[PDB]
Coordinates of all heavy atoms in Angstrom, one line a residue:
Chain B
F110 N -14.8 45.0 -41.4 CA -14.5 43.9 -40.6 C -14.3 44.2 -39.1 O -13.7 45.3 -38.9 CB -13.2 43.2 -41.1 CG -13.4 42.5 -42.5 CD1 -12.7 43.0 -43.6 CD2 -14.2 41.4 -42.6 CE1 -12.8 42.4 -44.8 CE2 -14.4 40.8 -43.8 CZ -13.6 41.3 -44.9
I111 N -14.7 43.3 -38.3 CA -14.5 43.6 -36.8 C -13.7 42.5 -36.2 O -14.2 41.3 -36.2 CB -15.9 43.8 -36.2 CG1 -16.8 44.9 -36.8 CG2 -15.7 43.9 -34.7 CD1 -16.1 46.2 -36.6
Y112 N -12.6 42.8 -35.6 CA -11.6 41.9 -35.1 C -11.5 42.1 -33.5 O -11.2 43.2 -33.1 CB -10.3 42.1 -35.7 CG -10.1 41.9 -37.2 CD1 -9.0 42.5 -37.8 CD2 -10.9 41.1 -37.9 CE1 -8.8 42.3 -39.2 CE2 -10.8 40.9 -39.3 CZ -9.7 41.5 -39.9 OH -9.5 41.3 -41.3
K113 N -11.8 40.9 -32.8 CA -11.6 40.9 -31.4 C -10.5 39.9 -31.0 O -10.6 38.7 -31.3 CB -13.0 40.5 -30.7 CG -14.2 41.3 -31.1 CD -15.5 40.6 -30.7 CE -16.7 41.4 -31.1 NZ -16.5 42.0 -32.5
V114 N -9.5 40.3 -30.2 CA -8.4 39.5 -29.9 C -8.1 39.4 -28.4 O -8.1 40.4 -27.7 CB -7.1 40.1 -30.6 CG1 -5.9 39.0 -30.5 CG2 -7.3 40.6 -32.0
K115 N -7.8 38.2 -28.0 CA -7.3 38.0 -26.6 C -5.9 37.3 -26.8 O -5.8 36.4 -27.6 CB -8.2 37.2 -25.8 CG -9.5 38.0 -25.5 CD -10.3 37.5 -24.3 CE -11.6 38.3 -24.1 NZ -12.4 37.8 -23.0
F116 N -5.0 37.7 -25.9 CA -3.6 37.3 -26.0 C -3.0 37.1 -24.6 O -3.1 37.9 -23.8 CB -2.9 38.5 -26.7 CG -1.4 38.4 -27.0 CD1 -1.0 38.2 -28.3 CD2 -0.5 38.6 -26.0 CE1 0.4 38.2 -28.6 CE2 0.9 38.5 -26.3 CZ 1.3 38.3 -27.6
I117 N -2.3 35.9 -24.4 CA -1.6 35.7 -23.1 C -0.2 35.2 -23.5 O -0.1 34.2 -24.1 CB -2.4 34.7 -22.2 CG1 -3.7 35.2 -21.7 CG2 -1.5 34.3 -21.0 CD1 -4.5 34.2 -20.9
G118 N 0.8 36.0 -23.1 CA 2.2 35.5 -23.3 C 2.9 35.4 -21.9 O 2.7 36.2 -21.0
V119 N 3.6 34.2 -21.8 CA 4.2 33.9 -20.5 C 5.6 33.3 -20.7 O 6.0 32.9 -21.8 CB 3.3 32.8 -19.9 CG1 1.9 33.3 -19.8 CG2 3.4 31.5 -20.6
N120 N 6.4 33.3 -19.7 CA 7.7 32.7 -19.6 C 8.7 33.4 -20.5 O 9.6 32.7 -21.0 CB 7.7 31.2 -20.1 CG 8.6 30.3 -19.3 OD1 9.2 30.7 -18.3 ND2 8.8 29.1 -19.8
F121 N 8.6 34.7 -20.7 CA 9.7 35.4 -21.4 C 10.8 35.8 -20.4 O 10.6 36.4 -19.4 CB 9.2 36.7 -22.1 CG 8.3 36.4 -23.2 CD1 6.9 36.4 -23.1 CD2 8.8 36.1 -24.5 CE1 6.1 36.2 -24.2 CE2 8.0 35.9 -25.6 CZ 6.6 35.9 -25.5
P122 N 12.1 35.4 -20.7 CA 13.2 35.7 -19.8 C 13.3 37.2 -19.6 O 13.2 37.9 -20.5 CB 14.4 35.2 -20.6 CG 13.9 34.1 -21.4 CD 12.6 34.6 -21.9
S123 N 13.6 37.6 -18.3 CA 13.8 39.1 -18.1 C 14.8 39.7 -19.0 O 14.6 40.9 -19.4 CB 14.1 39.4 -16.6 OG 14.6 38.2 -16.0
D124 N 15.9 39.0 -19.3 CA 17.0 39.6 -20.1 C 16.9 39.2 -21.5 O 17.9 39.5 -22.2 CB 18.4 39.3 -19.6 CG 18.5 37.7 -19.5 OD1 17.4 37.1 -19.7 OD2 19.6 37.3 -19.4
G125 N 15.9 38.5 -22.0 CA 15.8 38.2 -23.4 C 15.4 39.3 -24.3 O 15.0 40.4 -23.8
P126 N 15.4 39.2 -25.6 CA 15.2 40.3 -26.5 C 13.7 40.8 -26.5 O 13.5 42.0 -26.9 CB 15.5 39.6 -27.9 CG 15.3 38.2 -27.7 CD 15.7 37.9 -26.3
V127 N 12.8 40.0 -26.0 CA 11.4 40.6 -25.9 C 11.3 41.5 -24.7 O 10.8 42.7 -24.9 CB 10.4 39.4 -25.8 CG1 8.9 39.9 -25.6 CG2 10.4 38.6 -27.1
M128 N 11.7 41.1 -23.5 CA 11.6 42.1 -22.4 C 12.6 43.2 -22.5 O 12.4 44.2 -21.9 CB 11.7 41.3 -21.1 CG 10.6 40.3 -20.8 SD 8.9 40.9 -21.1 CE 8.7 42.2 -19.9
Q129 N 13.7 43.0 -23.2 CA 14.7 44.1 -23.3 C 14.5 44.9 -24.6 O 15.3 45.8 -25.0 CB 16.1 43.6 -23.3 CG 16.4 42.9 -22.0 CD 16.4 43.9 -20.8 OE1 17.0 45.0 -21.0 NE2 15.8 43.5 -19.7
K130 N 13.4 44.7 -25.3 CA 13.1 45.5 -26.6 C 14.3 45.5 -27.5 O 14.7 46.6 -28.0 CB 12.7 46.9 -26.2 CG 11.4 46.9 -25.3 CD 10.9 48.3 -25.0 CE 11.4 48.8 -23.7 NZ 11.0 50.3 -23.6
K131 N 14.9 44.4 -27.9 CA 16.0 44.2 -28.8 C 15.6 43.8 -30.2 O 16.5 43.5 -31.0 CB 17.0 43.2 -28.2 CG 17.4 43.4 -26.8 CD 18.1 42.1 -26.4 CE 17.3 41.1 -25.6 NZ 18.2 40.3 -24.7
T132 N 14.4 43.7 -30.6 CA 14.0 43.2 -31.9 C 13.8 44.4 -32.9 O 13.6 45.5 -32.4 CB 12.7 42.3 -31.8 OG1 11.6 43.2 -31.4 CG2 12.9 41.3 -30.6
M133 N 13.9 44.1 -34.2 CA 13.8 45.1 -35.2 C 13.1 44.6 -36.4 O 13.4 44.7 -37.6 CB 15.2 45.6 -35.6 CG 16.0 46.3 -34.5 SD 17.7 46.5 -34.9 CE 17.6 46.4 -36.7
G134 N 11.9 44.0 -36.1 CA 11.0 43.6 -37.2 C 11.2 42.1 -37.6 O 12.2 41.5 -37.4
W135 N 10.2 41.6 -38.3 CA 10.1 40.3 -38.8 C 10.8 40.1 -40.2 O 10.7 41.0 -41.0 CB 8.7 39.8 -38.9 CG 7.9 39.7 -37.6 CD1 7.0 40.7 -37.1 CD2 7.9 38.6 -36.7 NE1 6.5 40.2 -36.0 CE2 7.0 39.0 -35.6 CE3 8.6 37.4 -36.6 CZ2 6.8 38.2 -34.5 CZ3 8.4 36.6 -35.5 CH2 7.5 37.0 -34.5
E136 N 11.4 38.9 -40.4 CA 11.7 38.6 -41.8 C 10.4 38.3 -42.6 O 9.4 37.9 -41.9 CB 12.6 37.4 -42.0 CG 14.0 37.7 -41.3 CD 15.0 38.5 -42.2 OE1 14.5 39.0 -43.2 OE2 16.1 38.6 -41.8
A137 N 10.4 38.4 -43.9 CA 9.2 37.8 -44.6 C 9.2 36.3 -44.4 O 10.2 35.7 -44.1 CB 9.4 38.1 -46.1
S138 N 8.0 35.8 -44.4 CA 7.7 34.4 -44.0 C 6.9 33.6 -45.0 O 6.3 34.1 -46.0 CB 7.1 34.4 -42.7 OG 5.7 34.8 -42.8
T139 N 6.9 32.3 -44.8 CA 6.1 31.4 -45.6 C 5.5 30.3 -44.7 O 6.1 29.5 -44.0 CB 7.1 30.7 -46.6 OG1 7.6 31.7 -47.5 CG2 6.3 29.7 -47.4
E140 N 4.1 30.3 -44.8 CA 3.3 29.5 -43.9 C 2.9 28.2 -44.7 O 2.6 28.4 -45.9 CB 2.0 30.2 -43.5 CG 1.0 29.4 -42.8 CD -0.3 30.2 -42.4 OE1 -0.6 31.2 -43.1 OE2 -0.9 29.9 -41.4
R141 N 2.9 27.1 -44.1 CA 2.5 25.8 -44.7 C 1.1 25.5 -44.1 O 1.0 25.2 -42.9 CB 3.5 24.7 -44.3 CG 3.3 23.3 -44.8 CD 2.1 22.5 -44.2 NE 2.3 22.4 -42.7 CZ 2.9 21.4 -42.1 NH1 3.5 20.4 -42.8 NH2 2.9 21.4 -40.8
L142 N 0.1 25.4 -45.0 CA -1.3 25.1 -44.6 C -1.8 23.8 -45.1 O -1.4 23.3 -46.1 CB -2.3 26.2 -45.0 CG -1.9 27.7 -44.5 CD1 -1.0 28.3 -45.6 CD2 -3.2 28.4 -44.3
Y143 N -2.8 23.3 -44.4 CA -3.5 22.0 -44.7 C -4.8 21.9 -44.0 O -5.0 22.5 -43.0 CB -2.6 20.8 -44.4 CG -2.2 20.9 -42.9 CD1 -2.9 20.2 -42.0 CD2 -1.2 21.8 -42.5 CE1 -2.6 20.3 -40.6 CE2 -0.9 21.9 -41.1 CZ -1.6 21.2 -40.2 OH -1.3 21.3 -38.9
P144 N -5.8 21.2 -44.6 CA -7.0 20.9 -43.9 C -6.9 19.8 -42.8 O -6.2 18.8 -43.0 CB -8.0 20.4 -45.0 CG -7.0 19.7 -45.9 CD -5.8 20.6 -45.9
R145 N -7.5 20.0 -41.7 CA -7.5 19.0 -40.6 C -8.7 19.2 -39.7 O -9.0 20.3 -39.3 CB -6.2 19.0 -39.8 CG -6.3 18.1 -38.5 CD -5.1 17.7 -38.0 NE -4.2 16.9 -38.9 CZ -3.0 16.4 -38.4 NH1 -2.8 16.8 -37.1 NH2 -2.2 15.7 -39.0
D146 N -9.4 18.1 -39.3 CA -10.5 18.2 -38.4 C -11.6 19.2 -38.9 O -12.2 19.8 -38.1 CB -10.0 18.8 -37.1 CG -10.0 17.9 -35.9 OD1 -10.8 16.9 -36.0 OD2 -9.2 18.1 -35.0
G147 N -11.8 19.2 -40.2 CA -12.8 20.1 -40.8 C -12.5 21.5 -40.7 O -13.4 22.4 -41.0
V148 N -11.3 21.9 -40.2 CA -10.9 23.4 -40.3 C -9.6 23.6 -41.0 O -9.0 22.6 -41.6 CB -10.8 24.0 -38.9 CG1 -12.2 24.0 -38.2 CG2 -9.7 23.4 -38.1
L149 N -9.0 24.8 -41.1 CA -7.8 25.0 -41.8 C -6.7 25.3 -40.8 O -6.8 26.0 -39.9 CB -8.0 26.3 -42.7 CG -6.7 26.7 -43.5 CD1 -6.3 25.5 -44.4 CD2 -7.1 27.9 -44.3
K150 N -5.5 24.7 -41.0 CA -4.4 24.9 -40.0 C -3.1 25.3 -40.8 O -3.0 25.1 -42.0 CB -4.1 23.6 -39.2 CG -5.3 23.0 -38.5 CD -5.1 21.8 -37.7 CE -4.6 22.2 -36.3 NZ -4.4 21.0 -35.4
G151 N -2.2 26.0 -40.1 CA -1.0 26.4 -40.8 C 0.2 26.6 -39.8 O -0.1 26.9 -38.6
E152 N 1.4 26.3 -40.2 CA 2.6 26.5 -39.3 C 3.6 27.4 -40.1 O 3.7 27.3 -41.3 CB 3.2 25.2 -38.8 CG 2.2 24.4 -38.0 CD 1.2 23.5 -38.8 OE1 1.6 23.4 -40.0 OE2 0.2 23.0 -38.3
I153 N 4.4 28.1 -39.3 CA 5.4 29.0 -39.9 C 6.7 28.9 -39.0 O 6.6 28.9 -37.8 CB 5.0 30.5 -40.0 CG1 3.5 30.7 -40.2 CG2 5.7 31.2 -41.0 CD1 3.0 32.1 -40.3
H154 N 7.9 28.9 -39.6 CA 9.1 29.2 -39.0 C 9.4 30.7 -39.2 O 9.8 31.0 -40.4 CB 10.2 28.3 -39.5 CG 10.1 26.9 -38.9 ND1 9.8 25.8 -39.7 CD2 10.2 26.4 -37.6 CE1 9.8 24.7 -38.9 NE2 10.0 25.0 -37.6
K155 N 9.3 31.5 -38.2 CA 9.5 33.0 -38.3 C 10.7 33.4 -37.6 O 11.3 32.7 -36.8 CB 8.2 33.7 -37.9 CG 7.1 33.6 -39.0 CD 5.8 34.3 -38.6 CE 5.9 35.7 -38.2 NZ 6.6 36.5 -39.3
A156 N 11.1 34.6 -37.8 CA 12.3 35.2 -37.2 C 12.2 36.7 -37.0 O 11.9 37.4 -38.0 CB 13.5 34.8 -37.9
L157 N 12.5 37.1 -35.8 CA 12.7 38.6 -35.6 C 14.2 38.9 -35.8 O 15.1 38.2 -35.3 CB 12.3 38.9 -34.1 CG 10.8 38.9 -33.9 CD1 10.3 38.8 -32.5 CD2 10.1 40.2 -34.5
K158 N 14.4 40.0 -36.5 CA 15.8 40.5 -36.5 C 16.2 41.1 -35.2 O 15.4 41.7 -34.5 CB 16.0 41.5 -37.7 CG 15.5 40.9 -39.0 CD 15.5 42.0 -40.1 CE 14.1 42.1 -40.8 NZ 13.9 43.4 -41.5
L159 N 17.5 41.0 -34.8 CA 18.0 41.5 -33.5 C 18.8 42.8 -33.8 O 19.6 42.8 -34.7 CB 18.8 40.5 -32.7 CG 17.9 39.4 -32.2 CD1 18.7 38.3 -31.5 CD2 16.9 40.0 -31.2
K160 N 18.8 43.8 -32.9 CA 19.5 45.0 -33.1 C 21.0 44.7 -33.2 O 21.8 45.4 -33.9 CB 19.2 46.1 -32.0 CG 17.7 46.4 -31.9 CD 17.5 46.9 -30.5 CE 16.2 47.8 -30.5 NZ 15.0 47.0 -30.6
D161 N 21.4 43.8 -32.4 CA 22.9 43.5 -32.3 C 23.1 42.3 -33.2 O 23.8 41.4 -32.8 CB 23.3 43.4 -30.8 CG 22.8 44.5 -29.9 OD1 22.4 45.6 -30.3 OD2 22.9 44.3 -28.6
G162 N 22.5 42.3 -34.3 CA 22.5 41.3 -35.3 C 22.1 39.9 -34.9 O 22.0 39.5 -33.7
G163 N 21.9 39.1 -35.9 CA 21.4 37.7 -35.7 C 19.9 37.7 -35.7 O 19.2 38.7 -36.0
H164 N 19.3 36.5 -35.4 CA 17.9 36.3 -35.4 C 17.3 35.7 -34.1 O 18.1 35.0 -33.4 CB 17.5 35.4 -36.6 CG 17.6 36.1 -37.9 ND1 18.8 36.0 -38.7 CD2 16.8 36.8 -38.7 CE1 18.6 36.6 -39.8 NE2 17.4 37.2 -39.8
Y165 N 16.1 36.0 -33.9 CA 15.4 35.4 -32.7 C 14.2 34.6 -33.3 O 13.3 35.2 -33.9 CB 14.9 36.5 -31.7 CG 14.1 36.1 -30.5 CD1 14.5 35.1 -29.6 CD2 12.9 36.8 -30.3 CE1 13.7 34.8 -28.5 CE2 12.1 36.5 -29.2 CZ 12.5 35.5 -28.3 OH 11.6 35.2 -27.3
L166 N 14.2 33.3 -33.0 CA 13.3 32.4 -33.7 C 12.0 32.0 -32.9 O 12.0 31.9 -31.7 CB 14.1 31.1 -34.0 CG 15.5 31.3 -34.7 CD1 16.2 30.0 -34.8 CD2 15.3 31.9 -36.0
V167 N 11.0 32.0 -33.7 CA 9.6 31.8 -33.2 C 8.8 30.8 -34.2 O 8.8 31.1 -35.4 CB 8.8 33.1 -33.2 CG1 7.5 32.9 -32.4 CG2 9.7 34.2 -32.6
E168 N 8.2 29.8 -33.6 CA 7.4 28.9 -34.4 C 5.9 29.3 -34.2 O 5.5 29.4 -33.1 CB 7.6 27.5 -34.0 CG 6.8 26.5 -34.9 CD 6.6 25.1 -34.3 OE1 6.5 25.0 -33.0 OE2 6.4 24.2 -35.1
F169 N 5.2 29.4 -35.3 CA 3.7 29.8 -35.3 C 2.9 28.5 -35.7 O 3.3 27.9 -36.7 CB 3.3 30.8 -36.3 CG 3.6 32.3 -35.9 CD1 4.8 32.7 -35.3 CD2 2.7 33.3 -36.2 CE1 5.1 34.0 -35.0 CE2 3.0 34.6 -36.0 CZ 4.2 35.0 -35.4
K170 N 1.9 28.3 -34.9 CA 0.9 27.3 -35.2 C -0.5 28.0 -35.2 O -0.8 28.5 -34.1 CB 0.9 26.1 -34.3 CG 2.2 25.4 -34.3 CD 2.2 24.1 -33.5 CE 3.3 23.1 -33.9 NZ 2.7 22.0 -34.7
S171 N -1.2 28.0 -36.3 CA -2.5 28.7 -36.4 C -3.6 27.7 -36.8 O -3.4 26.7 -37.5 CB -2.4 29.9 -37.4 OG -1.4 30.8 -37.1
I172 N -4.8 28.1 -36.3 CA -6.0 27.4 -36.7 C -7.1 28.3 -37.1 O -7.4 29.3 -36.3 CB -6.5 26.6 -35.4 CG1 -5.3 25.8 -34.8 CG2 -7.7 25.7 -35.8 CD1 -4.6 26.5 -33.7
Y173 N -7.7 28.1 -38.2 CA -8.7 29.1 -38.7 C -10.0 28.3 -38.8 O -10.0 27.3 -39.5 CB -8.3 29.6 -40.1 CG -6.9 30.1 -40.2 CD1 -5.8 29.3 -40.7 CD2 -6.5 31.4 -39.8 CE1 -4.5 29.7 -40.8 CE2 -5.2 31.9 -39.9 CZ -4.2 31.0 -40.4 OH -2.9 31.4 -40.5
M174 N -11.1 28.8 -38.2 CA -12.3 28.1 -38.0 C -13.5 28.9 -38.5 O -13.9 29.8 -37.8 CB -12.5 27.8 -36.5 CG -11.2 27.0 -35.9 SD -11.3 26.9 -34.1 CE -10.4 28.4 -33.6
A175 N -14.0 28.5 -39.7 CA -15.2 29.3 -40.1 C -16.4 29.1 -39.2 O -16.6 28.0 -38.7 CB -15.5 29.0 -41.5
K176 N -17.2 30.2 -39.1 CA -18.4 30.1 -38.2 C -19.6 29.3 -38.9 O -20.6 29.0 -38.3 CB -18.9 31.5 -37.8 CG -17.9 32.0 -36.7 CD -18.4 33.4 -36.2 CE -17.2 34.3 -36.2 NZ -17.6 35.7 -35.9
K177 N -19.5 29.1 -40.2 CA -20.4 28.4 -41.1 C -19.5 27.5 -42.0 O -18.6 28.1 -42.5 CB -21.3 29.3 -41.8 CG -21.8 28.9 -43.2 CD -22.1 30.1 -44.1 CE -21.0 31.2 -44.1 NZ -20.9 31.9 -45.4
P178 N -19.8 26.2 -42.1 CA -19.0 25.3 -42.9 C -18.9 25.8 -44.3 O -19.9 26.1 -45.0 CB -19.7 24.0 -42.8 CG -20.6 24.1 -41.6 CD -21.0 25.5 -41.6
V179 N -17.7 25.9 -44.8 CA -17.4 26.3 -46.2 C -16.2 25.5 -46.7 O -15.5 24.9 -46.0 CB -17.1 27.8 -46.4 CG1 -18.4 28.6 -46.0 CG2 -15.9 28.2 -45.5
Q180 N -15.9 25.6 -48.0 CA -15.0 24.7 -48.7 C -13.6 25.0 -48.2 O -13.1 26.2 -48.2 CB -15.0 24.9 -50.2 CG -14.1 23.8 -50.9 CD -14.0 24.1 -52.4 OE1 -13.6 23.3 -53.2 NE2 -14.5 25.3 -52.8
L181 N -12.8 24.0 -47.9 CA -11.4 24.0 -47.5 C -10.6 23.7 -48.7 O -11.0 23.0 -49.6 CB -11.2 22.9 -46.5 CG -11.7 23.2 -45.1 CD1 -11.8 22.0 -44.3 CD2 -10.8 24.3 -44.5
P182 N -9.4 24.3 -48.7 CA -8.4 24.0 -49.7 C -7.6 22.8 -49.4 O -7.8 22.1 -48.3 CB -7.4 25.3 -49.6 CG -7.4 25.5 -48.1 CD -8.9 25.3 -47.7
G183 N -6.6 22.3 -50.2 CA -5.7 21.3 -49.8 C -4.4 21.9 -49.2 O -4.4 23.0 -48.6
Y184 N -3.3 21.2 -49.4 CA -2.0 21.6 -48.9 C -1.4 22.7 -49.8 O -1.2 22.6 -51.0 CB -1.0 20.4 -49.0 CG 0.2 20.3 -48.2 CD1 0.1 19.7 -46.9 CD2 1.4 20.8 -48.6 CE1 1.3 19.6 -46.1 CE2 2.6 20.7 -47.8 CZ 2.5 20.1 -46.6 OH 3.6 20.1 -45.8
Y185 N -1.1 23.8 -49.1 CA -0.6 25.0 -49.9 C 0.1 25.9 -48.9 O 0.3 25.7 -47.8 CB -1.8 25.7 -50.6 CG -2.6 26.7 -49.8 CD1 -2.6 28.1 -50.0 CD2 -3.6 26.3 -48.8 CE1 -3.3 29.0 -49.4 CE2 -4.3 27.2 -48.1 CZ -4.2 28.6 -48.4 OH -5.0 29.5 -47.7
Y186 N 0.6 27.0 -49.5 CA 1.5 28.0 -48.8 C 1.0 29.4 -48.8 O 0.4 29.8 -49.8 CB 2.9 27.9 -49.4 CG 3.6 26.6 -49.1 CD1 3.4 25.5 -49.9 CD2 4.4 26.5 -47.9 CE1 4.1 24.3 -49.6 CE2 5.0 25.3 -47.6 CZ 4.9 24.2 -48.4 OH 5.5 23.0 -48.2

Side-chain angles (χ1 to χ4, degrees):
Chain B
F110 287 116
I111 303 297
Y112 299 158
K113 306 168 182 41
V114 194
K115 293 196 180 177
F116 182 108
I117 294 176
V119 306
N120 215 11
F121 295 96
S123 14
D124 56 347
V127 173
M128 296 313 299
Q129 294 295 316
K130 302 187 262 173
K131 314 167 256 210
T132 70
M133 300 168 20
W135 296 99
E136 299 279 7
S138 73
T139 295
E140 171 181 33
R141 181 290 297 274
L142 304 91
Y143 53 99
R145 166 160 305 179
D146 249 338
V148 298
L149 183 54
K150 308 180 85 173
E152 297 86 14
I153 329 179
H154 285 117
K155 284 179 55 55
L157 286 161
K158 304 172 234 160
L159 289 173
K160 305 156 152 76
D161 309 346
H164 288 93
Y165 175 56
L166 310 176
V167 191
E168 187 199 25
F169 283 39
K170 302 184 156 258
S171 304
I172 312 95
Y173 310 96
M174 307 171 266
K176 284 181 230 173
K177 145 211 45 150
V179 296
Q180 188 187 192
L181 286 162
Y184 203 89
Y185 81 110
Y186 287 89

